[PDB]
Amino acid sequence: TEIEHLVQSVCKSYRETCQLRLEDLLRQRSNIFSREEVTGYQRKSMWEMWERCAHHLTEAIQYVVEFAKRLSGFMELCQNDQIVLLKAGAMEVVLVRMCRAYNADNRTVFFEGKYGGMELFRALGCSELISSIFDFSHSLSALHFSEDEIALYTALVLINAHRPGLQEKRKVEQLQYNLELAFHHHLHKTHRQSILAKLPPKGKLRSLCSQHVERLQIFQHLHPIVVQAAFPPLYKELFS
Numbered sequence: 001t002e003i004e005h006l007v008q009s010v011c012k013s014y015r016e017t018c019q020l021r022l023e024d025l026l027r028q029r030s031n032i033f034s035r036e037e038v039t040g041y042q043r044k045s046m047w048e049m050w051e052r053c054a055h056h057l058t059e060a061i062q063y064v065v066e067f068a069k070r071l072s073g074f075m076e077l078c079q080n081d082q083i084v085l086l087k088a089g090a091m092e093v094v095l096v097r098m099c100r101a102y103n104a105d106n107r108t109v110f111f112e113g114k115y116g117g118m119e120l121f122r123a124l125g126c127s128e129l130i131s132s133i134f135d136f137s138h139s140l141s142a143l144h145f146s147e148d149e150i151a152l153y154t155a156l157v158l159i160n161a162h163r164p165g166l167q168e169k170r171k172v173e174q175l176q177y178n179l180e181l182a183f184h185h186h187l188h189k190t191h192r193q194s195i196l197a198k199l200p201p202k203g204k205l206r207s208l209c210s211q212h213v214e215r216l217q218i219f220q221h222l223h224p225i226v227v228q229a230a231f232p233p234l235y236k237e238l239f240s
């Protein structure tokens with residue numbers, strides 16, 4: 001019963017913070033940037049595409065923070081542990097969330113109101129990183145994640161008692177074990193335990209996210225965006 005309540009409260013936090021509705025993303029699959037619109041994005045300055053992408057990624061991060069803040073027990077952790085878990089996992093969650101807005105049939109992503117391929121981002125000059133982000137979304141797309149699966153799986157991406165630097169490791173372990181039981185219970189109930197052998201290897205998500213954040217840091221160093229900072233303790237760890 002506590003476990004059914006936890007499934008309900010994780011799914012509710014996800015629903016309130018998912019940013020884009022799955023029904024909207026699936027309906028808009030036929031709404032694809034024209035050749036003319038793609039060329040318009042490619043001709044934009046590296047620095048304007050950077051400003052647009054940095055602002056979208058900031059907002060995506062801020063929704064993952066509100067998601068974490070609404071997870072049962074997260075706000076009862078010490079601030080040090082909250083920041084450790086968000087600093088390690090918030091961008092891993094953004095990259096997982098991306099698969100909902102990715103169409104494997106044509107290798108497009110929902111960006112600024114329509115679907116486009118990775119060639120939309122040509123001006124940024126990051127083709128190998130962007131290709132690795134699209135390939136990651138392409139792998140995840142094969143799971144056909146349900147909304148509840150993405151919610152419980154992303155909760156576990158964040159609530160990981162193995163992150164270095166935790167001060168109350170036993171408190172994070174308690175949350176982790178309850179979220180693992182919630183997730184395994186839900187998969188059993190839905191006859192979806194077969195996704196467990198297909199989830200990304202932990203190291204893949206960590207290295208891809210580490211490369212992504214390092215690229216964002218390089219862009220931010222060369223051309224700082226102004227951030228609407230909502231979570232000062234976490235902002236202070238990423239920006240300088």
Ligand SMILES: CC(C)CCC[C@@H](C)[C@H]1CC[C@H]2[C@@H]3CC=C4C[C@@H](O)CC[C@]4(C)[C@H]3CC[C@]12C
Pocket residue numbers: 018019020050053056057060094095097098099101109110111121124126129130133212215216219
């Ligand atoms: C490496 C940097 C400079 C470039 C990254 C380019 C691409 C991969 C970025 C730029 C804007 C990003 C999107 C911004 C917002 C969201 C909404 C979120 O709900 C899921 C991920 C998603 C859909 C992001 C996917 C990745 C994305 C499309």
Ligand SMILES: Cc1cc2c(s1)c(-c1ccc(C(=O)O)cc1)nn2C(=O)c1c(Cl)cccc1Cl
Pocket residue numbers: 054055057058061062086087088089090091092213216217220225227228229230231232234235238239
């Ligand atoms: C694990 C994390 C990575 C990451 C986080 S958290 C944040 C962030 C954002 C907002 C707040 C807040 O207080 O509103 C707090 C944190 N930005 N960010 C980045 O990689 C990033 C981005 Cl998205 C854009 C430009 C430069 C950079 Cl470095």
